[PDB]
Design a protein around this ligand. Structure first.
Ligand SMILES: *[C@@H]1O[C@H](CO[C@@H]2O[C@@H](C)[C@@H](O)[C@@H](O)[C@@H]2O)[C@@H](O[C@@H]2O[C@H](CO)[C@@H](O[C@@H]3O[C@H](CO[C@H]4O[C@H](CO)[C@@H](O)[C@H](O)[C@@H]4O)[C@@H](O)[C@H](O)[C@@H]3O)[C@H](O)[C@H]2NC(C)=O)[C@H](O)[C@H]1NC(C)=O
Ligand SMILES: *[C@@H]1O[C@H](CO)[C@@H](O[C@@H]2O[C@H](CO)[C@@H](O)[C@H](O)[C@H]2NC(C)=O)[C@H](O)[C@H]1NC(C)=O
Ligand SMILES: *[C@@H]1O[C@H](CO)[C@@H](O)[C@H](O)[C@H]1NC(C)=O
Ligand SMILES: *[C@@H]1O[C@H](CO)[C@@H](O)[C@H](O)[C@H]1NC(C)=O
Ligand SMILES: *[C@@H]1O[C@H](CO)[C@@H](O)[C@H](O)[C@H]1NC(C)=O
Ligand SMILES: *[C@@H]1O[C@H](CO)[C@@H](O)[C@H](O)[C@H]1NC(C)=O
Ligand SMILES: [Cl-]
Ligand SMILES: [Zn+2]
Lengths: 198, 588
């Protein structure tokens, strides 16, 4: 494999997906330098489960999937196997058998602005927790009670999406962070997403 | 089942998002006072009020006695009971017009020199100075009588209207009166020996005050003796202190009587303010030092935003600003302090106090919004003074800073220190209890409006041993001329804070293994004592305060004994000075 994996598009993308509406891309037949990923000090979080980053340059996988959204700094703990809370439960759930790498960096410079930036959303409520890698962009009215809702916001009937308000003055735990989850997939198939060393 | 919880998370997240926006609007005002910036506060202050009234009413949809998890029930009860001003449309807005008008008449007070009529002065910078620095009786009398004449009288009709609508509001929330509503803050349900009813409070306040009274009486006769040196022929040896002759504009603290009352003048003074001026301390460095204090007991450092977003220096922008110190929890991990901090020892000491509040805000953010608060209203001020107790000791001032370390610390300086303490701390206790005992009585109807001043001054004379220069009929509204009264703030907190301080510092110092006098205790370098305090802060309002108290001091109510122990040496000294004189006061 000669051509380069377009991880650069994923990471240097100017526009980034709201988290309930989280963006997935497949990276498929390409060779990558993962060093440019780990050998870099932009990344507040860089955790890997099932792989060790320094070896990713020897290793070929059949597919890599890049999921990317924005979340608050405190929530980056929720993007992990066996984790709970309104992000892990209602917007993005990684599976307990995950083999891959959560990567996150602080993005207050771009995703927060004076007066607030409200262009990002998230799902406070859901009837049930999500399935691993389940995406859900519904705007249906949450009903926890007995009396139904007719698209009616009221007693026990709440619109399921809320906006992030990102301000420059916000404490670090409530500032916007851009997140990127790489799943390294191993199928008994040929493997064409390879590290820099064959 | 309890769908209340699924309601609460919705409230929790909508609350902080707007309260964030309310805080930001307010802060932009306080640091930059514009017509535009004043207006934007009201828009956010409007939205937040509108937001609460619906949640209050929506909360009522959920019955509090179906809820078993006490933590969830406690939040629900706060929402349906507190702020539930479902009064009437023409009275939720008459009350607000009353509450702005009183707030700003006080803010805009100007009284004039009876001999220099065009010389008129605001309280916030100017008149405060005369009342902290002057020894000219007639000068203080007009500044005192003037403020009570010019602003107090304008506030009298408002207070009367304030009373009715507030009592109505509290009636609607199943409370006997606004006073009952206020005392409700100390109510706590656990049904396990940690329960506390509102009507225990006045019993426990009057119980502890009875224990404090001797000490106060002796501090009073001593201060009276030294003051007849400065005002012979105006102070009777056997009677009350004139109200215009104390530390400040009211008799609230006696701090600025120290110059006049210092037991041992000839001991070298302890005031470290010149050493900072010598050493080129500036605002930043003072807080960097208070940071070191907290770090040293194991609390966190400050946030980066605290440095960049705080206002420490009063601006030279010409930006006009409210210079009164405050510590802001703006809901988003955004903590700031707003202080015009000058390079003195007293500011150094308050910056330790006010960073105390920031630490308590940081400490409980792990809580749902409705529980981000101190276990009762007494706990936040107690937590900030705990800091000043340790950082004002000579032991502390030597180590980190510029007491000379060649400093002689003997029985004579210790009495000097305690007297300084008692003037500000023990002096305030009668002044504060007598004020809430008025308000409580006024809200309960025990005092007709035709005897408000008649019964205020009578109470002043009986309890604070303070009396008034000129006689005041019912056209004055003297209590309204303190900030907290005309800005609708509960006040007994400054009493309960005061007893808590010494309960904490005693148990905390015992965890730091300090030996000897409690008042020379400095907690610095004790991670053990810090963890002990850090546990309860974290709890926020999420458990009854009675349980929070015991998790530190191992007691479940106010105990005065630590305060008595702390001032024990000054007690023996004072009783000797007064030994063949009168201890008490006449009421004529
Ligand atoms: C507030 O204080 C914290 C706490 O710092 C500790 O406590 C203070 C009182 C001092 O004793 C410090 O010496 C203590 O470390 C500060 O956080 C620390 O900041 C320093 C930088 O000044 C960090 O040191 C660097 O860490 C780099 C690697 O970071 C990654 O790993 C750490 C540790 O596991 C992790 O915390 C972090 O999230 C990263 O994933 C490394 O490249 C470099 O060489 C150096 O080691 C130190 O790690 C921080 N500690 C913690 C616990 O975060 C804050 O800086 C301070 N804030 C302010 C505003 O002053
Ligand atoms: C990529 O980063 C790794 C660290 O994540 C670098 O190796 C480590 O960093 C120290 C630098 O202080 C090196 O001296 C050590 O070899 C490594 N540490 C340990 C504990 O083994 C690595 O050098 C970087 N990649 C390249 C190509 O330089
Ligand atoms: C774009 O992102 C890639 C991925 O790490 C990086 O290698 C590249 O340097 C980035 N482009 C820049 C910094 O101009
Ligand atoms: C105060 O508010 C006005 C309103 O526009 C603004 O122009 C000014 O810059 C503000 N001052 C500061 C210091 O931000
Ligand atoms: C109440 O709810 C909290 C929520 O975390 C839970 O931890 C606790 O166990 C529940 N029960 C009691 C008795 O507090
Ligand atoms: C804390 O430890 C240092 C270490 O020498 C010491 O000098 C300092 O005096 C200690 N703090 C106090 C308040 O004594
Ligand atoms: Cl008064
Ligand atoms: Zn305070």
């Amino acid at each position: 494999p000669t051509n380069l994996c377009p991880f650069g598009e994923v990471f240097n993308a100017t526009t980034f997906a709201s988290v309930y509406a989280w963006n997935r891309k497949r990276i498929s037949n390409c060779v990558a330098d993962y060093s440019v990923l780990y050998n870099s000090t932009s990344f507040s979080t860089f955790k890997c489960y099932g792989v060790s980053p320094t070896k990713l340059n020897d290793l070929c996988f059949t597919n890599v999937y890049a999921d990317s959204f924005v979340i608050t700094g405190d929530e980056v703990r929720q993007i992990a196997p066996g984790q709970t809370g309104k992000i892990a439960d209602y917007n993005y759930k990684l599976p307990d058998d995950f083999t891959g790498c959560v990567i996150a960096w602080n993005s207050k410079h771009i995703d927060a602005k004076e007066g607030g930036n409200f262009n990002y959303l998230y799902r406070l409520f859901r009837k049930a927790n999500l399935k691993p890698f389940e995406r859900d962009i519904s705007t249906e009215i949450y009903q926890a009670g007995s009396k139904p809702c007719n698209g009616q916001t009221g007693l026990n009937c709440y619109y399921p999406l809320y906006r992030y308000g990102f301000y420059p003055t916000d404490g670090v735990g409530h500032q916007p962070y851009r997140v990127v989850v790489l799943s390294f997939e191993l199928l008994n198939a040929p493997a064409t997403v390879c590290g820099h060393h064959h | 089942e309890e769908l209340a919880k699924t309601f609460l998370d919705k409230f929790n997240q909508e609350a902080e998002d707007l309260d964030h926006q309310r805080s930001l609007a307010a802060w932009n005002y306080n640091t930059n006072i514009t017509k535009e910036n004043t207006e934007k506060m009201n828009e956010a202050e409007a939205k937040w009020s509108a937001f609460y009234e619906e949640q209050s009413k929506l909360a009522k949809d959920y019955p509090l006695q179906e809820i078993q998890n006490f933590t969830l029930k406690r939040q629900l009860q706060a929402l349906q009971q507190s702020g539930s001003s479902a009064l009437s449309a023409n009275k939720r807005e008459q009350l607000n017009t009353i509450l702005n008008t009183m707030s700003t008449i006080y803010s805009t007070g100007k009284v004039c020199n009876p001999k220099k009529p065009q010389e008129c002065l605001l309280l916030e910078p100017g008149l405060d100075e005369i009342m902290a620095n002057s020894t000219d009786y007639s000068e203080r009398l007009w500044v005192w009588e003037g403020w009570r004449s010019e602003v107090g009288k304008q506030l009298r009709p408002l207070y009367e209207e304030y009373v009715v609508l507030k009592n109505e509001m509290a009636r609607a929330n199943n409370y006997e009166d606004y006073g009952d509503y206020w005392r409700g803050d100390y109510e706590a349900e656990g049904a396990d020996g940690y329960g506390y009813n509102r009507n225990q409070l006045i019993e426990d306040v009057e119980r502890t005050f009875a224990e404090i009274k001797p000490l106060y009486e002796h501090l009073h006769a001593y201060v009276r003796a030294k003051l007849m040196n400065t005002y012979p022929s105006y102070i009777s040896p056997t009677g009350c202190l004139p109200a215009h002759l104390l530390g400040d504009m009211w008799g609230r603290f006696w701090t600025n009587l120290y110059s006049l009352t210092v037991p041992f003048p000839e001991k070298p003074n302890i005031d470290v303010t010149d050493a900072m001026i010598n050493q080129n301390w500036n605002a930043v460095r003072i807080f960097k030092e208070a940071e070191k204090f907290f770090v040293s007991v194991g609390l966190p450092n400050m946030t980066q935003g605290f440095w960049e977003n705080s206002m420490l220096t009063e601006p030279t922008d010409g930006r006009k600003v409210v210079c009164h110190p405050t510590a802001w929890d703006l809901q988003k991990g955004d903590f700031r302090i707003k202080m015009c901090t000058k390079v003195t020892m007293d500011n150094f000491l308050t910056a330790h106090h006010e960073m105390g509040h920031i630490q308590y805000d940081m400490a409980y953010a792990m809580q749902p919004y409705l529980l981000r608060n101190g276990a009762n209203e007494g706990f936040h001020e107690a937590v900030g003074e705990i800091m000043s107790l340790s950082a004002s000791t000579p032991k502390h001032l030597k180590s980190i800073g510029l007491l000379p370390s060649d400093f002689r610390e003997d029985n004579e300086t210790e009495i000097n220190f305690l007297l300084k303490q008692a003037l500000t701390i023990v002096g305030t206790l009668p002044f504060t209890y007598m004020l809430e005992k008025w308000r409580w009585m006024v809200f309960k109807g025990e005092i007709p409006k035709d005897q408000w001043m008649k019964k205020w001054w009578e109470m002043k004379r009986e309890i604070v041993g303070v009396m008034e220069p000129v006689p005041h009929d019912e056209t004055y509204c003297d209590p309204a001329a303190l900030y907290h009264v005309s800005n609708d703030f509960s006040f007994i907190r400054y009493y309960t804070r005061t007893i808590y301080q010494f309960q904490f510092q005693e148990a905390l110092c015992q965890a730091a293994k300090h030996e000897g006098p409690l008042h020379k205790c400095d907690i610095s370098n004790s991670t053990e004592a810090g963890q002990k305090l850090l546990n309860m802060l974290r709890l926020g309002k999420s458990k009854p305060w009675t349980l929070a108290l015991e998790n530190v001091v191992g007691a479940r109510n106010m105990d005065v004994r630590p305060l008595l122990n702390y001032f024990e040496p000054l007690f023996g000294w004072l009783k000797d000075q007064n030994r063949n004189s009168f201890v008490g006061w006449n009421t004529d």
